[PDB]
C-alpha cells in the first residue's frame, strides 16, 4: 500500500481495511509449523507447485 494521511491513525485505517480478508483464510506461509519432508509430500502443501 502507498501511505495515506498521517502515521498517527494509519493502524485504524488498516485495522478496518483488512478486517475482512484477514479472517478469510491463511497466508502463504504455514511452513513454520511444517516439519521438513512434509513439504516434499504431496498432501498438506498446495504451495509445493
Amino acid at each position: 500500500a502507498a501511505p495515506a494521511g498521517p502515521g498517527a491513525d494509519m493502524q485504524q485505517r488498516f485495522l478496518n481495511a483488512w478486517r475482512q480478508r484477514l479472517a478469510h483464510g491463511r497466508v502463504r506461509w504455514v511452513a513454520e509449523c511444517q516439519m521438513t519432508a512434509e513439504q516434499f509430500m504431496q498432501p498438506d502443501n498446495a504451495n509445493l507447485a
Binding site: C33, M35, E38, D44
Partner: protein, 49 residues
C-alpha cells in the same frame, strides 16, 4: 478430539498414548509335490458334440 489431536500429530507431539501397526503381505512361492502311487481313482470318459 478428532481435531484436538490433529494439531499434535501434524506438528509432531506425542499425545501420551501409542500405537500398533498391522500390515498384510503377499508372496509368490514354488512347490514340490509328492504322493504315493494309486492315491486317486481318476476315471476317464465320453466326449459330447
Amino acid at each position: 478430539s478428532p481435531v484436538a489431536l490433529y494439531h499434535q500429530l501434524k506438528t509432531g507431539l506425542h499425545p501420551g498414548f501409542g500405537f500398533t501397526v498391522v500390515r498384510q503381505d503377499r508372496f509368490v512361492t514354488e512347490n514340490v509335490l509328492f504322493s504315493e502311487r494309486a492315491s486317486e481313482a481318476y476315471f476317464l470318459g465320453q466326449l459330447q458334440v
